[PDB]
Every structure is written in structure tokens, then in C-alpha cells.
Amino acid sequence: VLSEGEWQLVLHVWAKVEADVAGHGQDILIRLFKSHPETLEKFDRFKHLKTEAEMKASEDLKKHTVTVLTALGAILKKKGHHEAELKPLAQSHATKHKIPIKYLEFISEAIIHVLHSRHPGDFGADAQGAMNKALELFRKDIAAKYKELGYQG
Ligand code: HEM
């Protein structure tokens, strides 16, 4: 369970993401695909993309990243009270997309990397610790739902 102080550190950096969610989204998914290329294979819609330049140029990818970060932002804003938000997300990611917990760890790494790079003013050590805790909570709660849904993860 995160403290209110920890949630405020999470939300204060998220406020900066929201200046330009699309640009942050592109950076995060591209970082994921670069660091862990196997993750790209889960996206039938995007797996044809060969290079960072192609990824950056894809309007379709950009739009998807906005969807992803907006969904995550809505979860974070619930400050742990995210049961309603996690239900549809866990179901689609377990049963339609088949995304293991390991891959959610990878995207968490990418989020932390991009925030660390872009936002040193709001992503010092304590703030990064808080974001790590928030993403760990998200992954733990998704993992529990995965199990309930019949997916090993
Ligand atoms: C922060 C974690 C993530 C969030 C918040 C998130 C959110 C979303 C949302 C909102 C959608 C559209 C609605 C839906 O199908 O549920 C989506 C679709 C999808 N997600 Fe995720 N996602 C996350 C992580 C991942 C990861 C790590 C992968 C793969 C490695 C992945 C694979 C997919 C795929 C393949 C789709 C369908 C794309 C399409 O063909 O339109 N997701 N995601």
C-alpha cells in the first residue's frame, strides 16, 4: 500500500507526462521495443516496423501509445482503488493479447527509463521509488486477476 506522499510523487510526474502524452507514449513503447524486441511480436498491428524511425513515423502507433498511457494514468489517479479499471485490462491482456507479467515488468522499466530521462525535476530518487511502487502494485493486482481469469502470466 502506497502512502499519500508516495501517490503525490507519482501524480506530480504524471502531470508533466500530460503536457504531451503522445510524445511520452512514443518514447515509452519505442524504448520497450528496443530493449526487449520480443515484446513487439505481441503486436500484430505493429510488428512489421523495422526501425526506430519507422516507429516514430507511425501515426497508428502514436495513437495506441496515447490509449495506453491514458489507461495507465486513470489507474494511477485512483491511488490503488483501481478494481474497475483493472477488470477489462486484465481480461484483454490475459486472453486476447496474452501478455506475461514479465512483459509488464519490461514496460514498467521503459516507463521509468523515459521519466528518468525527460523529468529529472520530478523524478529524483524518492519520486522514482514511488513510481516503482505504483507500477509494482499495478503488476501485482493484474497478476492476481490473471490467475482468477485462468492465465498463468
Ligand atoms: C502499462 C501497461 C499497459 C497498459 C496500461 C496497456 C493498455 C492497453 C489498452 C488500454 C489497450 C486497448 C484496449 C485493450 O485491448 O485492453 C491495449 C491493447 C493492447 N496491448 Fe496493452 N497495455 C499495457 C501493456 C502491454 C504490453 C507490455 C504489451 C505487449 C508486450 C501489450 C500488448 C497489447 C496489444 C497487442 C494490444 C492490442 C493492440 C491492437 O492491435 O490494437 N500491452 N493495451
Give the CATH number for residue 151.
1.10.490.10
- Rounded distance from Cα 69 to ligand 1 centre (Å): 10
Q: Which long-range contacts (CB under 8 A, 24 or more apart) does 116-120 make?
A: 117/27, 118/16, 118/24, 118/27, 119/13, 119/16
Please report, in range form, the residues annotated as the binding site for O2.
Answer: 64
Alpha helices in 2-124 (DSSP H): 4-17, 21-35, 52-57, 59-77, 83-91, 101-118
Closest ligand 1 atom to residue 39 Cα is 30
- Rounded distance from Cα 102 to ligand 1 centre (Å): 14
Q: How was this structure determined?
A: X-ray
Ligand 1 in reach of 87 Cβ (< 6 A)? no
Ligand 1 in reach of 92 Cβ (< 6 A)? yes
Output the nine-digit C-alpha cell for 77.
489517479
- Domain of residue 58, residue span: 1-153
Q: Give resolution, Å, one decimal.
A: 1.1
- Rounded distance from Cα 80 to ligand 1 centre (Å): 20
Q: Residue 124: which of 16, 3, 1, 9 has the closest Cα?
A: 9
Spatial separation of the C-alpha atoms in residues 68 and 40, rounded to whole Å: 15
Spatial separation of the C-alpha atoms in residues 42 and 103, rounded to whole Å: 10
Residue having the nearest C-alpha atom to atom 40 of ligand 1: 45
Closest ligand 1 atom to residue 69 Cα is 5
Q: Position of cell 482503488?
A: 81
Work out how many domains the chain is built from and give that number.
Answer: 1
Cα dihedral: 14, 115, 146, 98 (round 10): 120
The number of angstroms, rounded, from the C-alpha of 52 to the middle of its chain's C-alpha atoms is 19
